[PDB]
RNA sequence: UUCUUAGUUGGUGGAGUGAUUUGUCUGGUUAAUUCCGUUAACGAACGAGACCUUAACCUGCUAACUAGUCUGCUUGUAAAUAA
């Protein structure tokens, strides 16, 4: 019957949370920071609380986590590692209109103007 | 140098030729290679720890078990001394290579499963398991022994030694413990 | 007594049966004269792992059920 | 506290004296071979029988058994 | 109630009302090995 | 072709958990290899080893004593000059006096408060160093007088992983233009330098991790330095504005040792170790990951167990690493083939 | 005693004219309205937990003429020494 209370889940989410660069994959280190780190009233408590929060560090060594935020850390350098682009993957020069959207232009009356139809057989 | 049974009875003068019993058993084991039947084990704590008890220890245990009368193992290791003495006696063989094939046979291959439906009592056919099969033999072994041994000047050590005796012989006249055996047996054999 | 038993070993424990929630059902798998390898789905009664060996004295049945 | 009981501790020192000789006055190789030795026979010379009494309980006559409950 | 000296009630935390304080802030000085 | 070939030599089995720590005897005559190894385990032991002569059976030594000690962990080993007494630091908030001969301890220095990560002993052996997750580094007498303890202004942010001492140039000349020193680094991932008196000489933030160890080279001229921050960082005891050199080793690293010799430093990550060379400008060298003794538990299969603790022997032939399972290896370098 | 089962509420928001409902759920999961997760709900209160006592580990600390071991002495049986 070893699941844990939501307050043990609470304090590991959050712990984690705040301190994920410091947080070991060792649970006795975590352990450790966890009482340095905060107000753990009931020794063994302290432990449940490490010994969970150790679990998600491994889990996190993964990726998906629900309910935790990695800001700073890593949700953030994700974003500077994906915005370098160099033509824009729509060409406004050349673009392309097939049977269905010439007859929508043609009725527009936009039919031709800069941009070219292609025939298939 | 290899530790005998009560000092006078060596382990590997037997070995386990069906492959059923082969762990369902502990002659085979060096840790069970010992010189008296008390362990004051932790078995009994897993859900299959049992397996690893020394078979006589075994005996001994399901032996002291009649109420007011018992609940001390000191004396049973007795009774289950004198009566390896008194089997020796006899067929002057390795007393654990009888009391052995005893528990091989002795254990029920069949049994019928009490499934009843609105008042009708019905039954089918069930296979019995190897350690459900060995506990039934010993348990059977010893039920017997008491049977006669009470009013009697015969004792149990004398009752046991009798019955380990006829137990592996298949002897269906002499072992109360084989009767229900063939019985069960049988009846199961009705039932499916 | 002549009787006909043939050794077979457990391949996989199912599941449990008889609302008496103590009765195990299992696969089987042979090893004796007569044939060997078949298999079949029978229905124990006590302590079994996977991988016991189990004598059966009627190889000609294997009922079943899993709901 | 018992026969039974004494027995197994004077069981238990001799095994763990025998050992504990070896790491001090003896190469410490020494002494992880009877160690093993005999934790490989039984573990009774060297664990320690964990299990102690277990207290009563005034829910009946003994530590878990009670009173009769005559229901009908 | 967390201070000895105070006549409030308690003394000793809620088993469960777990804190966990943020990080502080802080700044400091080198001692690099000056370049000229 | 002249290759760098790592042949193994034999392991070292007694270790209940990790091998927290790892020394070898110092040369007592000149360039005569020391047969005396001594390790510190999570086990809350140390242990001194009976070195074997050209083993193979399948081991390479066996244990001769046992140190019954600390009622915790053993974070570090600092070794007398002559291979007889022994310092160790554990999370039991003390240190230990072991006299090398003699399974007892005469000596145990209580007054750290927190966990003990590391424990610094002086050339002129009567100063001794400890440092912990108080923040503060210790100074203690050959006997047990705690004497002096690095102030705030002094200490770091959060805890100190490893203190050591700058060795010592035998010849009285007018050595380098540095004075021996101590360097400590912190899991604030700064490297910070000690003028002997306990003042502040050079406090750089070195990485953005923690950092787990450091190492100094014999001549007392660079610093090693690596931790979380999975690279490894060397320093010039002179310019330091930037590090003397920079490797990037795969997974974390717990521990750097230089050769006594050699010119090479040894890197102990998660993986396994990585041995780079100042030498060239290559970027590893040579590289061992080879873990699995126990792992061949017929089913139990621990992958990877990552090393605790590197250790060169006297010359700088042989070299030791501890690793999870408690286990130390020996691997020995064959160059010169193919 | 129900029951030591694991339940019980109220603020705002949603549905009903209304008693009332949702919140406290479809599915998993757990000894548990315990978690995962779902999600017209969101935030919360008391309960199980957490906690407290006792039991099991510590050849490492703290100590001990109202515990006990050892060390040098000495005494009795013994030939002494051993015991
Ligand atoms: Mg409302
Ligand atoms: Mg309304
Ligand atoms: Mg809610
Ligand atoms: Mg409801
Ligand atoms: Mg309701
Ligand atoms: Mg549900």
Do not use: H, L, M
């Given at each position: 019957g070893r699941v844990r209370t939501k307050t043990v889940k609470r304090a590991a989410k959050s712990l984690i949370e705040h301190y994920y660069s410091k947080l070991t994959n060792d649970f006795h280190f975590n352990k450790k920071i966890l009482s340095e780190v905060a107000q753990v009233p009931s020794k063994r408590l302290r432990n449940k609380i490490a010994g969970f929060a150790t679990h998600l560090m491994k889990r996190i060594q993964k990726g998906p986590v629900r309910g935790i935020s990695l800001k700073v850390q890593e949700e953030e350098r994700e974003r500077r590692l994906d915005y370098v682009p160099e033509?824009?993957?729509?060409?406004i020069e050349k673009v392309t209109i097939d049977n269905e959207t010439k007859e929508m232009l043609k009725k527009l009356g936009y039919q031709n103007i800069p941009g070219l139809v292609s025939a298939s057989a | 140098t290899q530790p005998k049974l009560?000092?006078?009875?060596?382990?590997?003068?037997?070995?386990?030729?069906?492959?059923?019993?082969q762990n369902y058993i502990a002659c085979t084991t060096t840790k069970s290679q010992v010189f008296v039947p008390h362990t004051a084990g932790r078995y009994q704590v897993k859900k299959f720890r049992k397996t690893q008890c020394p078979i006589v220890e075994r005996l001994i245990g399901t032996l002291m078990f009649h109420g007011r009368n018992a609940g001390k193992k000191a004396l049973c290791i007795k009774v289950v001394k004198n009566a390896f003495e008194i089997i020796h006696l006899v067929t002057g063989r390795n007393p654990l290579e009888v009391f052995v094939g005893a528990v091989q046979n002795a254990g029920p291959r069949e049994d019928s499963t009490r499934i009843g439906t609105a008042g009708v009592v019905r039954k089918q056919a069930v296979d019995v398991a190897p350690m459900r099969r060995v506990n039934l033999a010993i348990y059977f072994i010893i039920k017997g022994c008491r049977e006669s041994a009470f009013k009697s000047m015969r004792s149990i050590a004398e009752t046991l030694a009798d019955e380990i005796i006829n137990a592996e012989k298949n002897n269906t006249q002499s072992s109360w413990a084989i009767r229900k055996k063939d019985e069960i047996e049988k009846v199961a054999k009705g039932n499916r | 007594n002549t009787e006909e038993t043939t050794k077979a070993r457990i391949m996989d424990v199912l599941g449990k049966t008889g609302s008496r929630g103590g009765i195990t059902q299992v696969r089987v798998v042979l090893i004796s004269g007569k044939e060997e390898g078949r298999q079949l789905i029978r229905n124990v009664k006590g302590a079994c792992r996977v991988g016991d060996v189990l004598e059966l004295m009627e190889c000609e049945r294997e009922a079943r059920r899993l709901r | 506290s018992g026969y039974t009981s004494q027995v197994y501790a004077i069981r238990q020192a001799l095994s763990k004296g025998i050992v504990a000789y070896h790491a001090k006055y003896v190469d410490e190789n020494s002494k992880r071979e009877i160690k093993e030795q005999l934790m490989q026979y039984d573990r009774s010379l060297l664990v320690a029988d964990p299990r102690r009494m277990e207290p009563k309980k005034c829910?009946?006559?003994?530590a878990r058994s009670k009173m009769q409950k005559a229901y009908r | 109630e967390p201070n000895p000296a105070k006549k409030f009630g308690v003394k000793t935390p809620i088993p469960d009302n777990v804190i966990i304080h943020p990080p502080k802030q802080i700044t400091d000085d080198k001692e690099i090995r000056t370049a000229v | 072709s002249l290759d760098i070939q790592v042949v193994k030599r034999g392991i070292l089995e007694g270790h209940s958990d990790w091998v927290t720590s790892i020394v070898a005897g110092f040369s007592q005559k000149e360039n005569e290899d020391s047969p005396v190894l001594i390790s510190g385990s999570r086990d809350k032991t140390v242990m001194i080893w009976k070195l074997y002569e050209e083993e193979q059976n399948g081991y390479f030594g066996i244990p001769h004593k046992a140190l019954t000690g600390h009622n915790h962990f053993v974070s570090d080993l600092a070794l007398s000059q002559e291979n007889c007494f022994a310092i160790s630091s554990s999370w039991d908030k003390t240190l230990r006096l072991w006299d090398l001969r003699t399974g007892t301890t005469y000596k145990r220095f209580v007054g750290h408060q927190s966990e003990v990560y590391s424990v610094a002993f002086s050339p002129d052996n009567r100063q001794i160093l400890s440092a912990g997750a108080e923040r503060e580094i210790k100074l203690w007498n050959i006997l047990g007088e705690c004497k002096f303890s690095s102030a705030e202004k002094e200490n770091h942010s959060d805890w100190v992983s490893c203190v050591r001492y700058s060795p010592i140039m035998?010849?009285?000349?007018?050595?380098?233009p540095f004075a021996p020193y101590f360097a400590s680094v912190g899991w604030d991932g700064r490297l910070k330098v000690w003028?002997?008196?306990?003042?502040?000489r050079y406090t750089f933030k070195a990485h953005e991790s923690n950092v787990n160890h450091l190492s100094i080279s014999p001549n007392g001229k660079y610093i090693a330095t690596g931790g979380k921050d999975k690279k490894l960082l060397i320093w010039d005891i002179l310019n330091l504005t930037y590090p003397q050199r920079e490797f990037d080793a795969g997974s974390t690293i717990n521990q750097i040792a230089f050769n006594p010799k050699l010119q090479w430093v040894a890197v102990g990550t998660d993986q396994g170790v990585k041995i780079f060379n100042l030498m060239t400008q290559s970027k590893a060298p040579v590289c061992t990951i080879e873990a699995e003794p126990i792992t061949k538990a017929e089913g139990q299969k621990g992958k990877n167990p990552q090393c605790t603790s590197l250790a060169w022997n006297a010359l700088g032939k042989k070299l030791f690493a501890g690793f999870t399972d408690g286990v130390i290896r020996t691997f020995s370098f064959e160059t010169s083939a193919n």
């Open positions: 033509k824009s993957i729509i060409d | 009560f000092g006078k009875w060596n382990y590997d003068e037997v070995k386990i030729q069906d492959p059923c019993f | - | 829910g009946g006559r003994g | - | 035998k010849s009285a000349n007018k050595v380098q003028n002997t008196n306990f003042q502040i």
